[PDB]
Amino acid sequence: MRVLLIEKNSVLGGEIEKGLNVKGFMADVTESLEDGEYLMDIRNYDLVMVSDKNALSFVSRIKEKHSSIVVLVSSDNPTSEEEVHAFEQGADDYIAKPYRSIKALVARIEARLRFWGSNVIEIGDLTISPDEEKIIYKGREVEVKGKPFEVLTHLARHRDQIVSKEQLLDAIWEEPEMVTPNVIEVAINQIRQKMDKPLGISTVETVRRRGYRFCYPKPACEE
Amino acid sequence: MRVLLIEKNSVLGGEIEKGLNVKGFMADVTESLEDGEYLMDIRNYDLVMVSDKNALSFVSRIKEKHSSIVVLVSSDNPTSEEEVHAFEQGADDYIAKPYRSIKALVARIEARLRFWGSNVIEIGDLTISPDEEKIIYKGREVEVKGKPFEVLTHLARHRDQIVSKEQLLDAIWEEPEMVTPNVIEVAINQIRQKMDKPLGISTVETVRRRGYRFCYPKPACEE
Fold first, then answer.
1. Where does the record place the modification 4-aspartylphosphate (chains A, B) (predicted)?
2. Å from B85 to nearest chain A CA?
3. Cα–Cα nearest to B86, from B107, B3, B112, B95
4. Do B80 and A88 touch (CB under 8 A)?
5. Which of B56, B54, B65, B40 lies closest to B90, judged by CA?
């Protein structure tokens, strides 16, 4: 996890840099959104913090381009106008720039995410965390954010149950996504040729009785 | 949903009372927390807010006695010492008592709770939401957190699956406790009599083989 501090004043970024260090978090200082937009492109950050007034525009694109991320905007003018705009535009939390006491700022970031990590589904050595939008295989952590991984998260949860072709559709989409008609055909034959490879364990059965039946692998129950 | 506003000043708790009401929310004003604690024990609330300063100890147990609830404490003295103690003691958010502009406070309560409504399991007209810890039957929402509640939600998720008797024993009582592999007959018998009463529809199949099997109602299909 990394923290992004978009501030032109290196002095204020200096104190915060040694402020979150106590939590063992990494801090990054940038100038205008341009440096933050170009710097974040090569590296992703868990906490997106920016004290720039044009933050409303930046957080707006960060919320839609990456809603699965935290945003902490600041402002030396905590007025009711910026308060509603911060939550309406798309801000996870807003702190008065003047900083109540540094530890007050980081403290809010700490309670926001201390352990940072969770998982809902767990089968064998494979662990899928749909709440945190994160898939793990063989102990390998991989991020997800697209239609190709969307289905991967679908069977990840509704596993161990019957799955018809219409099931993936209504569980994913087709018309609204302007996808190519009959997407279940190429999407399932490939996802399987791409899933059994990395996992190495089969967990899908094809039958004409209904469609595709997903069954948990050999007893993954602890001995 | 319901909102709880504890404030010794009826004038301030008054404006808020009729403030968020415009959003179509329900709210009640009380004096000391004693009234709120004696009023909430008989009625449950989703948003529990308090402007009392000695609430630190109260809001603290609220998270313990109700970690699945929202907590909004206020304070006419926004000091870094109270802020850290607010998140440390047990507060989801803290607002400077003076209120930025009422609507500003309600806006934060709305964004945090706009639609509020989800369910991981669904079947026919019955709805069950274990993540939020709540059972819904015949369009009636009811909260449960006793010993025989998690067991009901347990078979709700593991629906359409076979489960042995011992599994249930270690499912709710996994930590070392006086389980004595034999009380299951009592817990299962009590659940069967406590589940059919409310849900006039059976959803559990009892079979001497293996143990108890869970499946959706037999007449669920229109046939």
1. 46
2. 10
3. B95
4. no
5. B56
Q: Which of B78, B87, B101 sits opposite A80 (nearest CB)?
A: B101
| Partners of B5 in beta bridges | B29, B49
Alpha-carbon distance A164 to nearest alpha carbon in chain B (angstroms) = 16
Assigned fold of A118-223: Arc Repressor Mutant, subunit A (1.10.10)
The CATH number given to B1-117 is 3.40.50.2300
- Using CB atoms and an 8 Å cut-off, which of residues 101-130 of chain B contact chain A? 101, 103-104, 107-108, 111
Contacts of A40 by beta carbon, 8 Å cutoff, 6+ apart: A4, A48
Report chain A's C-alpha Rg in angstroms. Answer: 22
Structure determined by: NMR
Chain A nearest C-alpha distance from B107 (Å): 7
B204 token code pair: 């559990």
Give the chain A residue whose CA is nearest to the CA of B82.
Answer: A104
CA dist., res. A135 & res. A121, Å (int): 10
In Å, how far is B175's CA from the nearest CA of chain A? Answer: 16
Q: Does B182 touch chain A (CB under 8 A)?
A: no
A134: left (phi over 0), alpha (psi -120 to 50) or beta: beta
Parse chain A into domains and list their residue ranges: 1-117, 118-223
Tally of CA atoms within 13 A in the half-sphere of A155 that contains its CB:
23
**A1-117 and A118-223 share one CATH topology?**
no
User: Nearest Cα to B74, choosing from B46, B102, B43?
Assistant: B102
Interface test with A, best of B81, B84, B123 (most A CBs within 10 A): B84
> In this structure, how many other beta carbons lie within 10 angstroms of the beta carbon of residue B5?
23
Between CA B84 and CA B28 the distance in angstroms is 28
Query: Is the separation of the CB atoms in A64 and A90 below 8 Å?
Result: yes
